[PDB]
């Protein structure tokens, strides 16, 4: 009695469809965070070198 073996493996195939959009989200995730780190390395140099 495991024809419900396929249907719990069939539904996990439909999520591979949206997983190709999860990649974009994954790629997008931390882009802000890495950029979130690019703002501090850019602000600290330019605010000081003119002050000197």
């Amino acid at each position: 009695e495991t024809f419900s073996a396929i249907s719990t493996i069939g539904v996990l195939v439909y999520i591979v469809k949206k997983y190709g959009a999860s990649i974009g989200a994954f790629a997008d995730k931390l882009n802000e965070q890495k950029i979130a780190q690019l703002e501090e390395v850019k602000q600290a140099s330019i605010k000081q070198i003119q002050d000197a």
Binding site: Q33, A44, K47
Partner: protein, 56 residues
């Protein structure tokens, strides 16, 4: 089924909450990082006034 007698699993659940407090404790947080964003500016800002009083 209606199982019985209970001497099992519950001693093997609190060993698990030594694992999950080990992994999740090392989590980078965007908010925490944000809170380290202004700590570098205003020390150098009054340091500009440290030479403004050292001259004037």
């Amino acid at each position: 089924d209606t199982s019985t007698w209970f001497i099992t699993i519950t001693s093997m659940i609190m060993t698990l909450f030594i694992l999950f407090q080990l992994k999740i404790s090392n989590y980078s947080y965007p908010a925490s990082p944000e809170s380290i964003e202004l700590k570098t500016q205003k020390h150098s800002t009054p340091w500009e006034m440290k030479w403004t009083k050292i001259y004037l």
